[PDB]
Write a protein that binds this ligand. Structure first.
Ligand code: BCL
Ligand code: BCL
Ligand code: BCL
Ligand SMILES: CC[C@H]1c2cc3[nH]c4c(c3C)C(=O)[C@H](C(=O)OC)c4c3nc(cc4[nH]c(cc(n2)[C@@H]1C)c(C(C)=O)c4C)[C@@H](C)[C@@H]3CCC(=O)OC/C=C(/C)CCC[C@H](C)CCC[C@H](C)CCCC(C)C
Ligand SMILES: CC[C@H]1c2cc3[nH]c4c(c3C)C(=O)[C@H](C(=O)OC)c4c3nc(cc4[nH]c(cc(n2)[C@@H]1C)c(C(C)=O)c4C)[C@@H](C)[C@@H]3CCC(=O)OC/C=C(\C)CCC[C@H](C)CCC[C@H](C)CCCC(C)C
Ligand SMILES: CC(C)=CCC/C(C)=C\CC/C(C)=C/CC/C(C)=C/CC/C(C)=C/CC/C(C)=C/CC/C(C)=C\CC/C(C)=C/CC1=C(C)C(=O)c2ccccc2C1=O
Ligand SMILES: COC(C)(C)C/C=C/C(C)=C/C=C/C(C)=C/C=C/C(C)=C/C=C\C=C(C)\C=C\C=C(C)\C=C\C=C(C)\C=C\CC(C)(C)OC
Ligand code: HEC
Ligand code: HEC
Ligand code: HEC
Ligand SMILES: CCCCCCCCCCCCCCCCCC
Ligand SMILES: CCCCCCCCCCCCCCCCCC
Ligand SMILES: CCCCCCCCCCCCCCCCCC
Ligand SMILES: CCCCCCCCCCCCCCCCCC
Ligand SMILES: [Fe+3]
Ligand SMILES: [Mg+2]
Ligand SMILES: [Mg+2]
Ligand SMILES: [Mg+2]
Ligand SMILES: [Mg+2]
Lengths: 287, 342, 53, 273, 245, 49, 53, 53, 49
């Protein structure tokens, strides 16, 4: 239980102690196995040279099986089996960590809201790595374990399914991420503005409304015509954050399974803008 | 020691001078050209000084050509002995072509690079045998691939640019594979490779498209999946993307030069340059399949690749970083002999 | 730890030690089984010929 | 005096122009001089968007509506009203309306006696919009660099501007902004869940206080940011996300004119190796 | 085809509309939770309670407070304290004018809520905000300046007194108020104070010398209730509008 | 008054401020004369020819 | 102001006014130097011929 | 601000002012050095010919 | 005054700061003379020719 002056300026200064418990130890074991697999595959990909590892770490990854393997339960190791093992161990560690958060909420007498907000992110992660590859029958549709590689996977996923900008659930997830940033800036600024009135002590304001909660409500009522309460704004933020990953999982489930081209889907439904033909005589040379 | 309150205004002035530092440090701003419709932002982003420097580069200056002799005289096939591909040229034009070729391929090494120093008739060096197939390839490109290289045409300068080895050539496993034993498979990607624009994209795509006829068309032509049409291809999309990095770097252009990002698939929304690029892909594949690869037995081990394969050409071999080779300078009008086989 | 070092449980809590050991053993067993499945000669469900070369 | 506790707070004061003429409410909304200017600019802009919608020859839907900026050949000049001038006027009205909204929030804060953290944070979104439609276009010498005012066409603008650098994911400022946006959602989920768990402990449990709130995070991650530190952290995260978005867009075109992946040659070929 | 119901409809469109229904239900639920304080509404002209449907006002939820008691929301309690402010004509939206001293009366930015008349407690049941002179387990970090002994300057550039003690939150280890002995003792909320360690001064620009002499004081000199806290904080917040002007 | 000075501190500050501003303006004028002798500022009818 | 109007500092803070004036002067000087650097004739570091057409 | 204006430090505290002034001077020096590096004639590290046209 | 520094300590500080600034400006003038002797930085009418 050490102290931290620099962290004590933005917030509290105490770091620890941390309670791991049984599920915490299990999650750490699973996750360390996953991290060891990923990192050792990265280090072997530069022929064990740590100079080249330092040079190329953003470009390095553990790569999923190729499409030639399909949904083979355990492909050959150096052909995606390492990726499948790392994904299994990471998923087990993440699920055990979710159970750990649920249990920590229960043992403190607190509600399990953080656990069910983590469940949305776990749902998105599972759709990204396991659930969608199972339905499409190919491990190759899953992100690599790498810094620049999962950005490449992101771009190539958008390109493969025709401009994921035209995925309505991608639009909704972007709206919810922008709204998460919007709502959290709103709430941070509002609570900081009424911090002179005791507004940072929100739970005390929930069971006993003070002038801080009243003025925080009235600022937004006079600004945009409606407001929340000291507790309801946290439900607003919680739901906005949950919807990000919920719509993300929903829009990734629908890509390739029910919709294969999103721009053409928007064209069918009157969503894609039509632009004046600046290039009048361009056709497909292979037609 | 007492804590000094932060001078907000002084640090604001320091912030302004740091903004000035950033402006002098990182740009006179790039120059834009608009190719498509307003609000789309389809066009080229170029630094004016760098674009001017690349146009004023020595490789982009086509050497001056001497006045062409009238094609009415003794042919080269009767004056000379071993001239199977240039037996229809007048001997004066044959000598002019030899001088031009020396200026284009081996100006430093001179006439002796491709010829025996004491016998011009002897086909001793491998360079003469390679140069004969070079001549045949240039004639084939000019006569048969006008859909791409016309009206500028191609000569020995288009690829070689004054040195015997063209600047942008490639081999099969041009990027060394990573991984020791059962660990570290890079899958032909996940490296800081300049073939993929220094991205972690597939850096060995030229073999699938400029030597093989693999499909670059990943985007479906229907909004909904079909029963027999594949529903996957994200990793296959990375191969197309890496190939498009190669294409963009070889021409010094961005994706919007040939595509509307709204849909990379729709040709009706694409600039007419995408049609020329399609013919360029077909022509590069034809070059590699027909001329450059069957030359592997004629090369020494010093010229081959890590896989023992012949050197091959790509988009960047001719263009050398410009939308057109030498930015559009005509090179075939001065040499009608290189425009068609005899 | 030996058959006669029964005083270890005065220093290590039996409950947490057993749970951590169970977690470690399950992870090790899964890792080894997956490593066997990840090789041609030892994937018993893929059933490649034993002579793998 | 609409809420059950609002009557005692509805007093005179807070005006930034020094006058009582506009000091009044219409329904729940407070009207100021800047409220009037906000409505002026807003109705002008909305009516011009409707005009551009009904004058579109392709009969677009609400999604396909697009008021595009002028051509890059018009430079920083003035375009015909149907050739980019409408976009220019809507941009001016939008900037005016957003600044007026921020100033009206300043007025409301002054009336309520609270800090100006909210107008200051909204000024970051206003700065992002300005850097996208005014500053970056002037840095590049043409208003045609701004995004079209359409629900779906501004997505196409974003896509084509990103593919002008062949891989926008490799922009370092873009990476920082995405990291901060995802961290803002993570922190908002954690904070909302913690406050909801403290306020709704369940059946048979009392409402938990600051000790339980700090204990939950010290027991989970190993550090507790506090109840005042979490809101500062959230405001800082959102503002950093928008600031790094502004940086990444101001270095794309004005600074970087080539592919974004090759910018990392500074690290791949750092003088060390 | 795979994901189609017709030549126009398809699975993604139906899933999108299902999410639209779910999102609109969630927004309705959230707006119901927004109405747990301040509703039902009242008119700006006579204070008549406006009728709100039972589908917009949720049933009261009970908060079991940590130190005992049950708070319900909504609670049918309405703030009906007499506001010492007037307006000419009961026109909807017309702002009010304080009759006397708005800071002492609590009008506008000086208005405060009738919170609990008991001090805030901790988990173990001991007073949360106490002066540092009473607790020996709490000290000030040596890396930060000590506010005690610093001169206190109001918004009129007048030294109104000196800092005698600091009131610390025992649940968060943070200084909540500054006990200032006026040159007779007042509590200055820390967010309303700016420290200068080079000149050893504390500037409270929201107060004048006249306003400091009328700051509400706690009944006890080592104990402050939530209502006293709320009143003092509201006084200093209303000083931003009513003091230097 | 409104700032806290007493018309004597203000007089001394204005003395030093007036000298500093006058010196800065004189240096600016000298620099402008030098920059005009380098290259004249305002074009003729035919421009910079 | 003028050489005689010394009472302006009873209305304008002598320090915040100096900070604001320094910021304005730095910004103006940077802007004008950048404007001179952005034109062929007055860019003294590029050294183009003065007669620039 | 001259040699005799010693009471400027009664308005600007040296401890909260000299760090900002040093930062400003360092940034200005970097700005001018990079401005010289950004032109062909004054980039001393590249060593281009003095006569640049 | 508003700083709390004594009028004599401020005088000493200004003396030392004045010497430091004068030395800095002398070094800058020498550096500018050396840089002009290396490559003059005010072009003539013909430019850098
Ligand atoms: C299995 C029945 C007994 C037991 C019976 C014995 C006997 C007998 C001996 C040991 C010995 C050892 N035991 Mg023991 N040991 C037990 C449980 C454990 C546990 C545990 C937390 O469960 C651990 C970590 C160990 C660890 C160890 C090693 C530190 C030590 C020799 C290392 C070794 O052989 O390399 C390999 C070690 C590992 C790969 C990790 C340990 C895993 C297993 C459990 C180790 C058992 C090895 C032992 C030789 C097997 C004998 C069991 C037969 C039924 C006799 N024992 C249980 C309680 N153990 C030897 C010793 O200390 O002599 C100097 C020895 O002679
Ligand atoms: C360097 C030694 C002294 C000093 C000695 C003098 C003398 C002597 C004079 C000035 C004058 C001025 N000083 Mg002084 N000055 C000092 C430090 C400063 C600082 C600072 C925060 O460091 C600033 C902003 C200034 C600013 C100024 C100007 C406002 C004013 C006239 C403008 C000008 O000449 O050029 C425009 C301003 C700039 C380009 C930026 C200012 C930076 C430098 C330091 C300006 C000083 C130049 C000075 C003339 C050179 C003499 C130094 C010799 C080597 C001894 N001085 C130090 C304390 N200063 C003149 C004046 O008041 O006119 C009646 C004048 O005669
Ligand atoms: C420079 C020395 C004195 C000073 C000496 C004088 C004298 C003498 C005169 C003025 C006059 C004026 N001064 Mg004065 N003035 C000072 C500093 C200022 C500052 C400032 C914040 O520093 C400002 C905004 C001004 C503003 C003004 C103008 C409102 C007015 C004429 C406007 C003009 O000519 O437009 C052009 C200028 C601008 C658009 C920007 C203003 C910036 C500079 C500082 C203006 C001063 C120019 C002045 C003619 C210089 C003469 C001083 C010589 C060095 C002896 N002064 C200092 C204190 N000033 C004139 C006046 O009041 O007419 C009846 C006049 O005769
Ligand atoms: C609402 C949706 C958002 C969200 C939600 C969310 N995520 C969450 C939570 C919530 C509400 C949690 O409660 C949980 C959490 O604890 O957060 C702090 C979690 C979480 N969000 C995470 C990350 C994360 N969230 C992301 C995103 C988001 N999460 C969404 C935007 C992303 C992105 C942008 O991709 C990431 C990367 C984790 C920090 C955490 C879950 C941690 C976890 O699963 O841990 C188990 C996995 C492991 C690999 C274990 C660690 C293995 C190491 C080897 C440990 C070291 C062991 C060693 C022995 C220690 C000692 C060493 C000695 C030398 C000292
Ligand atoms: C800086 C951190 C985040 C932030 C902060 C923030 N935004 C804020 C606030 C804060 C703190 C407010 O106080 C304020 C508010 O009141 O919120 C309810 C606001 C606000 N954030 C808003 C939205 C918003 N914030 C966004 C983002 C963010 N806001 C950041 C992520 C986005 C994004 C990413 O897209 C949007 C859409 C509004 C709800 C509100 C400001 C309302 C406002 O300005 O009202 C006055 C203007 C009008 C009523 C309409 C004017 C219309 C124009 C005249 C014509 C239309 C022009 C427009 C460009 C057309 C666009 C077409 C297509 C591009 C769609
Ligand atoms: C002269 C003349 C013409 C007169 C007429 C005058 C008229 C007609 C009106 C008045 C003047 C004006 C300018 C009126 C404005 C008109 C308009 C356009 C109004 C709407 C503007 C607007 C921005 C509306 C909202 C838009 C949206 C969708 C915003 C996003 C909000 C969101 C995602 C979630 C809502 C969550 C809420 C309610 C947050 C607020 C909130 C926050 C952030 C807390 O932290 C907090 C803390 C403690 C207690 C309460 C709160 C609280 O309520
Ligand atoms: C040498 O290294 C040392 C030892 C120093 C350790 C260091 C390690 C380092 C440096 C590691 C670095 C790792 C990095 C940078 C990783 C980055 C990863 C990123 C960015 C990933 C992004 C996305 C990945 C996703 C979404 C993956 C999802 C995968 C899933 C969900 C897979 C699930 C698989 C399952 C459930 C498999 C089950 C087993 C079955 C059932 C198939 O068995 C039959
Ligand atoms: C490699 C790039 C060459 C350079 C350098 C030079 N020449 Fe060439 N030469 C080359 C080829 C491929 C051929 C065969 C022509 C054909 O139709 O296949 C030739 C041939 C000649 C000959 C004919 C000799 C004979 O057949 O007996 C002559 C006389 C000749 N070349 C002259 C010549 C001169 C003068 C050169 C320097 C300017 C020169 N060659 C360089 C390829 C190459
Ligand atoms: C002209 C030199 C081009 C540049 C610049 C870019 N692309 Fe390319 N693209 C070009 C052609 C000739 C083709 C057709 C190839 C074929 O075999 O038909 C394409 C096609 C694509 C595709 C696939 C289209 C499909 O039907 O699925 C993609 C995904 C694509 N192009 C992407 C892309 C990107 C990302 C670019 C910037 C790096 C880019 N293209 C530039 C020609 C040209
Ligand atoms: C040498 C044989 C070349 C190879 C290999 C490639 N290209 Fe090329 N290209 C070549 C020439 C001589 C010209 C000039 C055409 C003209 O009209 O003068 C071109 C031109 C193009 C263009 C047109 C650019 C424009 O602005 O219109 C494109 C889009 C193009 N080439 C694409 C392209 C690609 C993608 C290639 C690799 C597959 C490629 N070219 C190879 C000569 C040669
Ligand atoms: C564009 C998405 C939807 C945004 C809707 C925001 C609406 C905010 C303004 C609400 C105004 C309510 C006015 C009536 C309040 C009660 C008066 C008795
Ligand atoms: C309107 C006549 C036809 C078009 C002539 C050219 C118009 C564009 C060039 C002049 C205007 C551009 C510069 C505007 C600068 C504004 C700075 C605020
Ligand atoms: C940050 C706002 C703009 C600052 C001034 C920009 C000055 C350069 C404008 C150049 C326009 C012409 C060249 C591009 C076309
Ligand atoms: C037709 C769709 C309707 C969707 C309604 C969604 C309602 C969501 C409610 C979430 C919160 C429930 C209450 C949780 C209180 C705390 C429990 C510990
Ligand atoms: Fe909160
Ligand atoms: Mg390879
Ligand atoms: Mg390669
Ligand atoms: Mg280019
Ligand atoms: Mg079907």
């Amino acid at each position: 239980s050490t102290l931290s002056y620099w962290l004590g300026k933005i917030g509290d200064a105490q770091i620890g102690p941390i309670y791991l418990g049984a599920t915490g130890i299990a999650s750490l074991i699973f996750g360390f196995v996953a991290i060891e697999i990923i990192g050792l595959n990265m280090l072997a990909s530069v022929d064990w040279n740590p100079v080249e590892f330092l040079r190329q770490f953003p470009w390095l990854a553990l790569e999923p099986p190729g499409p030639e393997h399909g949904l083979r339960a355990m492909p050959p190791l150096n052909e995606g089996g390492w990726w499948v093992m790392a994904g299994f161990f990471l998923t087990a560690s993440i699920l055990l960590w979710w159970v750990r958060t649920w249990q920590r909420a229960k043992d403190l007498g607190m509600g399990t809201h953080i656990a069910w907000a983590f469940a949305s992110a776990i749902f998105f992660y599972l759709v990204l790595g396991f659930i969608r590859p199972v339905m499409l029958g190919s491990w190759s549709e899953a992100p690599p374990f790498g810094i620049f590689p999962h950005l490449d996977w992101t771009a190539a996923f958008s390109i493969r399914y025709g401009n994921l900008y035209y995925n309505p659930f991608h639009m909704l997830s972007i709206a919810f991420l922008y709204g998460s940033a919007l709502i959290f800036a709103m709430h941070g600024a509002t609570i900081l503005s009424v911090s002179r009135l005791g507004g940072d002590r929100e739970v005390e304001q929930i069971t006993d409304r003070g002038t801080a909660a009243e003025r925080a409500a009235l600022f937004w009522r006079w600004t945009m015509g409606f407001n929340a309460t000291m507790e309801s704004i946290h439900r607003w933020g919680w739901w906005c954050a949950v919807f990000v990953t919920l719509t993300a999982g929903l829009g990734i489930l629908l890509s390739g399974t029910v919709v294969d081209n999103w721009y053409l889907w928007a064209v069918k439904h009157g969503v894609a803008p039509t632009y004046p033909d600046v290039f009048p005589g361009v056709t497909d040379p292979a037609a | 020691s007492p804590r000094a309150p932060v001078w907000v205004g002084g640090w604001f002035v320091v912030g302004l001078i740091t903004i000035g530092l950033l402006t002098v440090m990182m740009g006179p701003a790039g120059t834009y050209t608009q190719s498509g419709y307003r609000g789309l932002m389809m066009g080229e982003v170029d630094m004016a000084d760098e674009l001017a420097d690349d146009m004023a580069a020595p490789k982009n200056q086509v050497p001056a050509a001497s006045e062409r002799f009238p094609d009415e005289g003794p042919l080269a096939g009767e004056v000379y002995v071993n001239v199977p591909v240039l037996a229809h040229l007048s001997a004066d034009n044959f000598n002019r072509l030899m001088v031009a070729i020396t200026e284009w391929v081996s100006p430093e090494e001179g006439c002796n690079y491709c010829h025996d120093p004491d016998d011009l008739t002897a086909e001793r060096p491998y360079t003469k045998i390679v140069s004969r197939r070079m001549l045949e390839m240039v004639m084939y490109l000019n006569s048969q691939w006008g859909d791409h290289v016309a009206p500028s045409g191609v000569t020995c300068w288009t690829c070689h640019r004054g040195n015997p080895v063209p600047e942008n050539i490639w081999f099969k496993n041009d990027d060394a594979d990573g991984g020791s034993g059962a660990l570290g498979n890079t899958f032909g990607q996940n490296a800081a490779s300049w073939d993929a624009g220094l991205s972690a994209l597939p850096n060995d795509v030229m073999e699938a498209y400029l030597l093989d006829d693999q499909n670059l068309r990943i985007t479906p032509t229907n909004d909904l999946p079909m029963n027999g049409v594949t529903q996957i291809g994200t990793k296959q999309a990375e191969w197309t993307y890496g190939m498009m990095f190669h294409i963009s770097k070889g021409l010094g252009v961005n994706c919007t030069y040939c595509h509307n990002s709204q849909s990379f698939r729709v040709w009706e929304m694409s600039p007419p340059a995408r049609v020329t690029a399609w013919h360029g892909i077909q022509m590069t594949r034809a070059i590699n399949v027909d001329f450059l690869d069957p030359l592997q037995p004629e090369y020494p081990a010093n010229r081959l690749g890590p896989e023992g394969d012949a050197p091959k050409a790509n988009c960047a071999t001719c263009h050398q970083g410009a939308f057109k080779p030498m930015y559009g300078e005509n090179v075939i009008d001065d040499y009608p002999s290189l425009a068609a086989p005899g | 730890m030996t058959f006669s070092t029964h005083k270890v449980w005065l220093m290590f809590d039996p409950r947490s030690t057993l749970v951590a050991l169970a977690a470690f053993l399950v992870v090790l067993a899964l890792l080894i089984h997956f490593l066997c499945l990840g090789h041609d000669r030892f994937n018993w469900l893929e059933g490649n010929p034993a002579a793998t070369k | 005096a609409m809420l059950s506790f609002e009557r005692k707070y509805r007093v005179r004061g807070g005006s930034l122009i020094g006058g009582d003429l506009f000091d009044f409410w219409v329904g729940p909304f407070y009207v100021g001089f800047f409220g009037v200017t906000t409505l002026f600019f807003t109705f002008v802009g909305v009516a011009l968007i409707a005009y551009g919608w009904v004058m579109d020859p392709s009969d677009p839907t609400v999604w396909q509506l697009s008021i595009a900026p002028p051509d890059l050949s018009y430079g920083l000049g003035f375009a015909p009203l149907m050739e980019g001038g409408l976009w220019q006027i809507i941009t001016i009205c939008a900037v005016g309306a957003f600044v007026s909204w921020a100033l009206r929030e300043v007025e409301i804060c002054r009336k309520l006696g609270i800090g100006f953290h909210v107008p200051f944070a909204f000024s970051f979104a206003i700065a992002a919009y300005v850097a996208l439609t005014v500053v970056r276009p002037m840095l590049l010498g043409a208003w045609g660099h701004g995004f079209p005012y359409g629900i779906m066409s501004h997505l196409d603008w974003v896509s084509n501007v990103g593919y002008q650098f062949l891989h926008f994911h490799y922009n370092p400022g873009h990476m920082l902004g995405i990291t901060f946006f995802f961290t803002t959602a993570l922190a908002l989920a954690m904070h909302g869940g913690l406050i909801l768990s403290a306020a709704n402990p369940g059946k048979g449990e009392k409402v938990k206080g600051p000790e339980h709130e700090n204990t939950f995070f010290r027991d989970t991650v190993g550090y507790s940011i506090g109840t005042l530190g979490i809101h500062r952290l959230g405001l800082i995260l959102a503002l950093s996300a928008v600031f790094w978005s502004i940086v990444c867009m101001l270095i794309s075109g004005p600074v970087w004119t080539k592919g974004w992946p090759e910018w990392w040659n500074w690290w791949y070929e750092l003088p060390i190796w | 085809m795979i994901g189609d119901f017709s030549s126009y409809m398809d699975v993604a469109q139906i899933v999108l509309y299902a999410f639209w229904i779910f999102l609109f239900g969630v927004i309705f639920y959230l707006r119901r939770e927004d109405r747990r304080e301040g509703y039902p509404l009242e008119r700006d002209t006579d204070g008549k309670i406006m009728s709100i449907g039972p589908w917009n006002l949720p049933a009261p939820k009970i908060f079991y407070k940590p130190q005992g008691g049950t708070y319900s929301a909504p609670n049918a309690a309405r703030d009906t304290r007499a506001i010492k402010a007037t307006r000419v004509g009961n026109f909807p939206g017309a702002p009010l004018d304080p009759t006397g001293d708005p800071l002492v009366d609590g009008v506008g930015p000086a208005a405060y809520a009738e919170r609990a008349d008991t001090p805030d407690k901790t988990l173990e049941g001991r007073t949360r905000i106490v002066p540092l002179r009473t607790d020996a387990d709490l000290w000030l970090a040596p890396e930060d300046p000590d506010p005690r002994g610093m001169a206190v300057v109001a918004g009129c550039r007048t030294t109104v007194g000196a800092v005698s003690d600091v009131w610390v939150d025992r649940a968060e280890n943070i200084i909540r108020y500054l006990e200032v002995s006026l040159g007779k003792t007042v509590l200055v909320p820390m967010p309303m104070a700016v420290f200068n360690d080079l000149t050893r001064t504390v500037t409270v620009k929201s107060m004048d010398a006249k306003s400091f002499a009328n700051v509400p004081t706690p009944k006890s000199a080592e104990q402050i209730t939530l209502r006293e806290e709320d009143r003092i904080q509201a006084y200093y917040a209303g000083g931003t509008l009513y003091a230097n002007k | 008054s409104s700032t806290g000075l007493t018309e004597a501190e203000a007089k001394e500050f204005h003395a030093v401020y007036s000298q500093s501003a006058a010196g800065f303006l004189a240096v600016c004028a000298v620099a402008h004369v030098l920059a005009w002798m380098w290259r004249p500022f305002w074009p003729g009818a035919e421009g910079w020819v």
